[PDB]
C-alpha cells in the first residue's frame, strides 16, 4: 500500500522481517517491521543485532503502530521506549481488550484523537453492511450425555464438533456457495478446523502452514472460480485484506475475547462490491444451545452491539432438511464420531553398514 | 565493408563479427491452480 | 514483393551479362529465376557437365555473386550425403559490385594520370626501366647519352608519349557504358535491403524438377551451439443476423439473466421472517378469410497416414 499510494522510491524502503534484514543506508527512509523483531531483548543474532544498533543510534521522527491494541502488552510496550521518535501514531479498528490495560495507551502513545462511527461510514458507502446472525444449534442427546460428566478442559472439544453444527455449517456454506459468495470459515480450535476440512474436502490454514503455502491457497481462493471457500484460523484474524470476502462463518472461537469477534467481522467489511444495490454481507456465529458457548457468545459480541450492529437469532434454517446429504445423518456415523472424539484424550567401517 | 566507408561509399553489408547470437492440506492434490500473478 | 528486389535483380543481370562470358549468364540466371538451387538440379537445367559447371561456380563464388550452403541430409531410403545449394546474397553481391566498379574506374584514372607524366627510359639489353631521376645520374662523362649500369650501353626512350588521348578515350567509353550500374546503385542506396539466408531464400523457391533428390528444406539441428563462418546474417469474425423471432429470443435471454442477476444479492428466507416459532434444524377464422379473399377477388374482378496433428 505504501508504494502504490505515495511516491516513495523503493530505494529508501527496507523491510525487517525473518526473511530479509538489510537496512537502508540512504540518509532517510522507512522500516516496516514487526513488534516481535523490535521487542526481542534476550537473543538477537549478528544479522539482527546490526539492525538494532542502526535503529537505536539514529534519532527517528515518526512511528506508526498498526493494530495498536496490543502495544501495552508486557514487552511489546518496550519498543515505544527503546525506539526514539518525536511523534507516535496508533491505528487499531478495535480499542478494547479483556484486561484493564487498555487505558494505559494514554501515556504509552498519547490520548485518543478521533473516533469514526461505524454506522455513519456504512450508510455513506465507505464500508459494507453486515447482517449479523447467531444460529442456535441444539446438541444431540447422545453427545450431551457426555457433556454433563466431561470436565471443562475437554468440554470445549466435546461441543465444538457436535453433529448439529456440522449440518448448519455445511448447509450454510452450500447455500452461500450457490449464491456465489466468497466464504471464510474461522475456527480457533485447530483440531476442529482439521476435522471440518478433511471431511468437507476444502483447504484449511493454521499456524503450522508456511507463508508460501498459505499465500498460494489465498491467491487461489481469490482469483480462481473453482475455489470459493477457505478455512482460516486465528492467524488471519487481524490486518488481512480480503476484498472478495462477503460471507463469514464462525463454528467456534476464542472464549470471551471481544476484539476477536469484531476484528474477524472486519474481514467481510472489506467487500469490494459494497456499493451495489441490495448487497448485504453475511456474518454467522454458530453456537451450541445449552452450553457455555452461549455465555461466551453473548459476552464476545458485546462490542458490536455498542457500535450499532444487531445480532439476529436463527432457531432453524428453512429448506435444510431437503438437502440431499448431511454430515453424520445416520446414528451409526454419529456414534463413530462420539467414540473418536471421546478417545482423543571410520571410513573402513562405513562399508559394512 | 570497412574499406567502402573509408572511400565514402555506403556499404550494404556488416562485419559478421558484429552479429550477436540471441505445506498442509494435501487432500486437494490437483484442485489448486497456480494463480500466482493476478 | 518489393520494387527494390527487381532493381537488385536487374543490376545482377546486367553485371553478369556484360562482365562475364555466356555460360555465366545461364548459371546466374537459373539461380535468379529460382531460389536456392541444388547442384544436381542446376546441372540438368543447363545440361552442362560437372567439369564445365566448376569454373562457372568457382568464379562466381570468388566474386561473391553466389553464396554456398552445405547441410547434412538423411534420405529415408539411402545413406546420408552432404548436399550443396547455391543462392544470391544481395548485400554480398552489391558490396562486391560496388568495390569492383570503383577499383576499375580508379585504376583507369590512376593509369590516365600516370600516362601524363614524362615517358622515362629503358635499356634494350637488360630491359631495366629507368626513371628520369634515375637516368640522370647514370649519364656518361661526355654527358651526351645515358648509360646503363648493368650493360654500360646507351638507353632508349620509352613509349606511351602518344597515349595521352587514347587513355582519355578509354575512360570516356567505360563511364558511358557502365552508366546503368551507377543508376541502379543510386536507387539501391536510397532503399534498404534485407540480407538473404538459405532459409529465407527458400520462401521464394520455384522447384526446378518434379522429383528432385535434394530436399529443399532447412531443418537446423536442435539446440546446436556450433557456429560456422559466414553462416549467420543480421482472429476470426462471425456474424449472426438477428430477426424478429431472434430479437425477442435475445430479450428473453436478457430477461432471464436479469432475473438471475438479482438473486446473488437477494436476502434469504431465514433473514426475511423472524423464525422463533418454527421447529429445530438438523436430521372459423380461416373460412371467414377465404370467403373474404374470394369476395375481394370478386370485387377486383367486378371492378376490373497417421501423424501428430492439431485442429486449426
Ligand atoms: Mg489495516
Ligand atoms: Zn642494361
Largest separation between any pair of C-alpha atoms in chain B: 76
CA C185 remoteness from chain centre: 16
* A203/B28 touch (CB, cutoff 8 Å), yes or no: yes
Residue numbers preceding breaks in chain C (C to N > 2.5 A): 234, 283, 304
Q: What residues have CB less than 8 Å from A188, skipping those under 6 apart?
A: A233, A234, A252, A253, A254, A260
Q: Residue C118 forms beta bridges with which residues?
A: none
Residues of C in contact with A314 (CB under 8 A): 270, 275
Task: Report CB contact under 8 Å: B12, C230.
Answer: no
Chain B residue with Cα closest to A226: B31
The residue assigned the cell 456474424 is C239
* Residue in the block written with cell 532517510: A28
CA-to-CA separations, C271 to A135, A261, A280, A318, C275, in angstroms, rounded: 11, 21, 11, 10, 9
Q: Are A283 and A131 in contact, with CB atoms under 8 Å apart?
A: yes
Rg of chain C over Cα atoms, rounded to whole angstroms, equals 44
Separation of alpha carbons A330 and A337, rounded Å: 11
CA gap C157, C150 in Å, rounded: 17
d(CA C161, CA C167) in angstroms, rounded, equals 11
Torsion angle (degrees, nearest 10) of CA C76, C82, C88, C91: 120
DSSP 3-state percent helix, strand, coil across chain C (nearest 5): 50, 10, 40
Q: Which residues contact B4 (CB under 8 A, 6 or more apart)?
A: B10, B11, C95, C98, C99
Inter-chain contact B33–A224, Cβ cutoff 8 Å? yes
C270: nearest CB among A163, A317, A326: A317
* Optimal mutation site among A314, A330, A331, A334, interface C, most CBs of chain C within 10 A: A314
Resolution in angstroms for this experimental structure? 3.2
The CA-CA-CA angle for residues C249, C254, C257, to 5°, reads: 130
H helices, E strands: number in chain A? 16, 10
Using an 8 Å Cβ cutoff, are A185 and A169 in contact?
A: yes
Cβ distance of B12 and C227 shorter than 8 Å? no
Per-window interface: C 187-216 vs B, CB < 8 A: 188-189, 193, 195
**CB within 8 Å: B28 and A216:** no
Per the listing, cell 533428390 goes with C213
Chain length of chain A:
353
A323 touches C: beta carbon within 8 Å = no
Beta bridge partners of C85: C38, C69
Contact C281 A320 (CB under 8 A): yes
Q: What is the number of alpha carbons within 13 Å of residue C8 lying toward its C-beta?
A: 25
Chain A residues with CB-CB distance to B24 below 8 A: 204-206, 208-209, 213
A67 and A92 Cβ atoms separated by less than 8 Å:
yes
Listed as own residue / partner, the contacts of A301-308 with beta carbons closer than 8 Å and 24 or more positions apart are A301/A132, A301/A134, A301/A258, A301/A261, A302/A258, A303/A94, A303/A96, A303/A258, A303/A259, A303/A261, A303/A262, A304/A132, A304/A261, A304/A262, A304/A265, A307/A117, A307/A118, A307/A119, A307/A262, A308/A117, A308/A118, A308/A119
Contact, A262 vs A303, CB < 8 A?
yes
Neighbours of chain B (3+ CB pairs under 8 A): A, C
Phi, psi of A64 (to 5 degrees): -115, 125
Query: From CA A210, how far away is CA A221, in angstroms rounded?
Result: 17
Could you give the CA distance from residue B3 to residue C98 in angstroms, rounded to a whole number?
Answer: 11
Q: Give the separation between CA A316 and CA C276, rounded to whole angstroms.
A: 8
> How far is the C-alpha of A181 from the C-alpha of C70, rounded, in Å?
66
Q: Return the residue of C nearest to A137 by Cα.
A: C281
Cα–ligand 2 centroid distance for C159 (angstroms): 17
Count, residues in chain C: 312
Cβ atoms B29, C108 nearer than 8 A:
no
Q: Is A318 on the interface with C (CB under 8 A)?
A: yes
Angle at A277 between CA A276 and CA A278, to 5 degrees: 115
Q: State the DSSP string of C89-142.
A: -HHHHHHHHHHHHHHHHHHHHHHHHHHHS---EE-TTT--EE-HHHHHTTB-TT
Cell numbers at A271, concatenated? 467487500
The count of residues in chain B is 38
C-alpha cell at C252: 428473453
Window 198-227 of A: residues touching B by CB (8 A cutoff) are 198, 201-206, 208-210, 212-213, 216-217, 219-220, 222-224, 226-227
d(CA A180, CA C265): 9
In degrees, to the nearest 5, what angle opens at C-alpha B12 toward C-alphas C25 and C220?
80
Complete DSSP assignment for C231-273: -------------HHHHHHHHHHHHHHHHHHHHTT---HHHHS
- First vs last C-alpha separation in chain B: 51
Cell of C93: 553481391
Angle CA A169–A260–A146, to nearest 5: 50
The alpha-helical segments, DSSP class H, found in A17-140 are: 35-39, 46-57, 78-82, 105-108, 118-123
Separation between Cα atoms, residue A93 and residue A107, nearest integer Å: 19
> Could you give the CA distance from residue C312 to residue C309 in angstroms, rounded to a whole number?
9
Nearest to C102 among B1, B9, B10 (CB): B9
The pairing of strands A87-91 and A62-66 is: parallel
The cell numbers describing A97, all together, are 481488550
From CA C158, how far away is CA C220, in angstroms rounded? 63
DSSP codes joined into one string, A258-316: SHHHHHHHHHHTT-TT-SSTT--EEEEEEEEETSHHHHHHHHHTHHHHHHT---EEES-
8 Å CB contact of B32 and A213: no
Cross-chain residue pair B12–C193, CB shorter than 8 Å: yes
Closest CA to A83 of A104, A48, A109, A59: A59
Helix (H), strand (E) at residue C292: helix C285-303
The region, left, alpha or beta by phi > 0 then psi within -120 to 50, assigned to residue C223 is left
**Enclosing H/E stretch for A179:** helix A163-179
User: What span, in angstroms and rounded, lies between the C-alpha atoms of A38 and A34?
Assistant: 7
Amino acid at each position: 500500500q505504501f508504494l502504490q499510494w505515495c511516491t516513495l522510491q523503493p530505494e529508501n524502503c527496507a523491510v525487517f522481517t525473518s526473511d530479509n534484514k538489510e537496512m537502508f543506508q540512504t540518509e532517510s527512509g522507512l522500516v516496516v517491521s514487526t513488534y516481535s523483531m523490535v521487542a526481542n531483548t534476550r537473543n538477537r543474532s549478528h544479522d539482527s543485532q546490526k539492525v538494532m544498533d542502526f535503529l537505536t543510534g539514529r534519532e527517528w521522527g515518526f512511528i506508526i503502530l498498526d493494530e495498536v491494541h496490543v502495544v501495552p502488552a508486557a514487552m511489546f510496550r518496550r519498543v515505544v521506549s527503546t525506539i526514539a521518535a518525536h511523534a507516535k501514531l496508533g491505528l487499531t479498528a478495535t480499542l478494547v481488550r479483556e484486561d484493564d490495560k487498555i487505558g494505559d495507551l494514554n501515556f504509552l502513545i498519547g490520548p485518543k484523537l478521533y473516533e469514526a462511527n461505524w454506522m455513519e461510514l456504512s450508510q455513506k458507502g465507505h464500508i459494507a453492511n453486515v447482517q449479523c446472525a447467531e444460529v442456535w444449534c441444539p446438541m444431540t442427546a447422545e453427545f450431551y450425555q457426555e457433556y454433563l460428566r466431561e470436565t471443562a478442559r475437554k468440554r470445549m472439544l466435546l461441543y465444538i464438533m457436535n453433529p448439529t453444527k456440522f449440518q448448519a455449517c455445511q448447509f450454510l456454506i452450500q447455500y452461500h456457495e450457490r449464491r456465489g459468495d466468497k466464504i471464510i470459515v474461522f475456527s480457533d480450535n485447530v483440531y476442529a478446523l482439521q476435522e471440518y476440512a478433511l471431511k468437507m474436502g476444502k483447504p484449511f490454514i493454521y499456524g503450522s502452514t508456511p507463508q508460501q503455502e498459505r499465500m498460494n491457497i489465498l491467491q487461489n481462493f481469490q482469483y480462481n472460480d473453482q475455489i470459493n471457500t477457505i478455512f482460516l484460523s486465528k492467524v488471519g484474524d487481524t490486518s488481512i485484506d480480503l476484498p472478495e470476502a462477503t460471507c463469514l462463518i464462525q463454528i467456534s472461537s476464542h472464549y470471551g475475547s471481544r476484539r476477536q469477534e469484531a476484528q474477524r467481522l472486519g474481514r467481510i467489511l472489506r467487500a469490494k462490491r459494497r456499493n451495489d444495490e441490495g448487497f448485504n454481507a453475511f456474518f454467522y456465529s454458530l453456537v451450541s444451545k445449552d452450553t457455555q458457548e452461549m455465555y461466551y457468545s453473548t459476552k464476545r459480541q458485546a462490542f458490536l452491539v455498542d457500535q450499532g450492529y444487531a445480532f439476529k437469532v436463527i432457531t432453524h434454517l428453512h429448506g435444510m432438511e431437503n438437502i440431499p446429504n448431511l454430515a453424520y445423518a445416520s446414528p451409526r456415523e454419529r456414534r463413530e464420531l462420539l467414540q473418536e472424539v471421546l478417545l482423543k484424550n571410520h571410513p573402513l567401517i562405513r562399508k559394512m553398514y | 565493408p570497412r574499406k567502402l566507408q573509408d572511400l565514402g561509399l555506403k556499404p550494404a553489408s556488416v562485419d559478421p563479427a558484429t552479429i550477436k547470437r540471441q505445506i498442509t492440506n494435501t487432500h486437494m492434490t490437483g484442485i489448486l491452480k497456480d494463480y500466482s500473478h493476478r | 514483393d518489393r520494387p527494390i528486389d527487381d532493381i537488385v535483380k536487374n543490376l545482377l543481370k546486367f553485371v553478369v551479362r556484360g562482365f562475364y562470358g555466356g555460360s555465366f549468364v545461364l548459371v546466374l540466371d537459373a539461380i535468379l529465376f529460382h531460389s536456392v538451387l541444388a547442384e544436381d538440379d542446376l546441372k540438368q537445367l543447363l545440361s552442362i557437365n560437372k567439369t564445365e559447371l566448376g569454373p562457372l561456380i568457382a568464379r562466381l563464388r570468388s566474386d561473391r555473386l553466389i553464396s554456398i550452403h552445405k547441410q547434412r541430409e538423411y534420405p529415408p531410403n539411402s545413406k546420408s550425403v552432404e548436399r550443396v545449394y547455391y543462392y544470391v546474397k544481395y548485400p554480398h553481391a552489391i558490396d562486391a559490385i560496388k568495390w569492383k566498379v570503383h577499383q576499375v574506374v580508379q585504376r583507369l584514372k590512376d593509369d590516365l594520370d600516370k600516362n601524363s607524366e614524362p615517358n622515362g627510359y629503358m635499356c634494350p639489353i637488360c630491359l631495366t626501366k629507368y626513371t628520369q631521376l634515375e637516368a640522370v645520374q647514370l649519364l656518361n662523362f661526355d654527358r651526351t647519352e645515358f648509360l646503363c649500369s648493368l650493360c654500360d650501353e646507351p638507353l632508349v626512350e620509352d613509349d606511351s608519349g602518344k597515349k595521352n588521348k587514347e587513355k582519355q578515350d578509354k575512360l570516356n567509353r567505360l563511364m558511358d557504358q557502365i552508366q546503368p550500374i551507377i543508376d541502379s546503385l543510386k536507387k539501391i542506396d536510397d532503399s534498404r535491403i534485407e540480407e538473404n539466408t538459405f532459409e529465407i531464400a527458400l520462401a521464394r523457391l520455384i522447384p526446378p524438377q518434379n522429383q528432385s533428390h535434394a530436399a529443399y528444406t532447412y531443418n537446423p539441428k536442435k539446440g546446436s551451439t556450433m557456429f560456422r563462418p559466414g553462416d549467420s546474417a543480421p482472429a476470426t469474425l462471425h456474424i449472426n443476423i438477428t430477426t424478429a423471432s431472434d430479437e425477442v429470443a435475445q430479450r428473453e435471454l436478457q430477461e432471464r439473466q436479469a432475473e438471475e442477476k438479482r438473486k446473488q444479492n437477494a436476502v434469504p428466507e431465514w433473514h426475511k421472517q423472524s423464525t422463533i416459532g418454527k421447529t429445530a434444524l438438523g436430521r372459423e377464422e380461416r373460412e371467414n378469410e377465404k370467403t373474404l379473399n374470394d369476395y375481394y377477388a370478386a370485387l377486383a374482378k367486378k371492378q376490373a497416414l497417421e501423424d501428430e496433428f492439431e485442429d486449426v
